[PDB]
């Protein structure tokens, strides 16, 4: 399948070169997979989600996304226009309030919620969780992310936007999950992207167009935007039967575009997420 005039990041993940504008992907499109977006919520009524999104949990007075961030990330996973995996099922877990903030205890509860809740969902092709959030190093946050991964969920987490080593942030620093840095449309490391040995992969993160609340769209930047590209890619590859939740991060690294990014510090992987789709 070909989507013309796609957002640059979608075009990038199906290309061996920067500078193109068509997204190419297998029409299976993540059907039969599930992606949990653990964030500020998802505006499931957005026409871009086509009835494939729903809220499954909140820790606050509403399950509504009163911020937009979670809706944007969900859109990059699985919206019809802005998404990588255009037929996946999207499940929202609101661990962040409408200001984008959340206690680590709530975030941990949300991760253990997903590990159990997947047993209440139909995801025959597999389960992914996208965590576009983080704070300072916490062994308990890392352990929760490790449990979620161990339970059979492909966990993708943001590296963080500190232009620093991700070793000092959580859940970025948990080795067993898929830690995602950000790149721009010219194949530069995004100015704000964290780096370091713990990164597994980069995805598009600067100037990413996606869904927003009030049935709208906008472009924003972050490792938060790179993460759902990788989560969606995992769901897509799992639907194709090419990899599994336990092995998808490694598979994505194996099959990445290699050595093509600039301003990657010595000791950080130079790997850009790539679907290797050939018509």
Q: Which stretch binds ligand O (CB under 6 A): 101-109, 157-165, 252-260, 266-274?
A: 157-165
**Binds ligand O (CB under 6 A): choice among 158, 261, 271, 272:** 158
Q: Does the annotation flag 260 for ligand binding?
A: yes
CB of residue 202 vs Ca ion: minimum separation in angstroms?
13
Task: Name the residue nearer to ligand TE (CB basis): 96 or 114.
Answer: 96
133 binds ligand O (CB under 6 A): yes
Task: Name the residue nearer to ligand TE (CB basis): 151 or 223.
Answer: 223
15 binds ligand TE (CB under 6 A): no
Q: Which stretch binds Ca ion (CB under 5 A): 11-19, 132-140, 195-203, 235-243?
A: 195-203
Q: Does the annotation flag 187 for ligand binding?
A: no
H/E/C letters for each residue in the chain?
CEECCCCHHHHHHCCCCCCCCCEECCCCCCCCEEEEEEECCCCCCCHHHCCCEEEEEECCCCCCCCCCHHHHHHHHHHCCCCCCCCCCEEEEEECCCCCCCCCHHHHHHHHHHHHHHHHHCCCCCEEEEEECCCEECCHHHHHHHHHHHHCCEEEEEECCCCCCEHHHEECCCCCCCEEEEEECCCCEECCCCCECCCCCEEEECCCEEEEECCCEEEEECCHHHHHHHHHHHHHHHHHCCCCCCCCHHHHHHHHCEECCCECCCCCCCCEECCCCCCC
Number of residues binding to ligand O, judged by CB under 6 A: 10
Question: What are the structure tokens assigned to 137, written together?
Answer: 């190093």
When CB distances are held under 5 to 8 angstroms depending on the partner's kind, the choice from Ca ion, ligand TE, ligand O, none that residue 200 binds is Ca ion
173 binds ligand O (CB under 6 A): no
159 binds ligand TE (CB under 6 A): no
Identify the bridge partners of residue 258 per DSSP, sorted by sequence position: 271
**Binds Ca ion (CB under 5 A): choice among 86, 182, 200, 206:** 200
- Indicate the residue whose CB is closest to ligand TE: 224
- Indicate the residue whose CB is closest to Ca ion: 200
Judged by the rule CB under 6 A, the positions of this chain that interact with ligand TE are 132, 158, 161, 222-224
Known binding-site residues for Ca(2+) equal 16, 175, 177, 200, 260
Judged by the rule CB under 6 A, the positions of this chain that interact with ligand O are 69, 132-134, 158, 160-161, 222-224
């Amino acid at each position: 399948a070909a989507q013309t005039n796609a957002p640059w990041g979608l075009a990038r993940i199906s290309s061996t070169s920067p500078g193109t504008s068509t997204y190419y992907y297998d029409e299976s499109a993540g059907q039969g997979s599930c992606v949990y977006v653990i964030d500020t919520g998802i505006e499931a009524s957005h026409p871009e989600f086509e009835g494939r999104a729903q809220m499954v949990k909140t820790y606050y007075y509403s399950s509504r996304d009163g911020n937009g961030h979670g809706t944007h990330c969900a859109g990059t996973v699985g919206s019809r226009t802005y998404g990588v995996a255009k037929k996946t099922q999207l499940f929202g877990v609101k661990v962040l309030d409408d200001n984008g903030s959340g206690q680590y205890s709530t975030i941990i509860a949300g991760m253990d919620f997903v590990a159990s809740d997947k047993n209440n969902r139909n995801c025959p092709k597999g389960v992914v969780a996208s965590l576009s959030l983080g704070g300072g190093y916490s062994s308990s946050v890392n352990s929760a992310a490790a449990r979620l991964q161990s339970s059979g969920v492909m966990v993708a987490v943001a590296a963080g936007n500190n232009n620093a080593d991700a070793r000092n942030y959580s859940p970025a620093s948990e080795p067993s999950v898929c830690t995602v840095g950000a790149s721009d449309r010219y194949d530069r490391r995004s100015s704000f992207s964290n780096y370091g040995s713990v990164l597994d992969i980069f995805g598009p993160g600067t100037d990413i167009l996606s869904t927003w609340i009030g049935g709208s769209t906008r472009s924003i930047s972050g490792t938060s935007m790179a993460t759902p590209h990788v989560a969606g890619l995992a769901a897509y590859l799992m639907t194709l039967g090419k990899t599994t939740a336990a092995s998808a991060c490694r598979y994505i690294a194996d099959t990445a575009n290699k050595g093509d990014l600039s301003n990657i510090p010595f000791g950080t992987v130079n790997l850009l997420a790539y679907n290797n789709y050939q018509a």
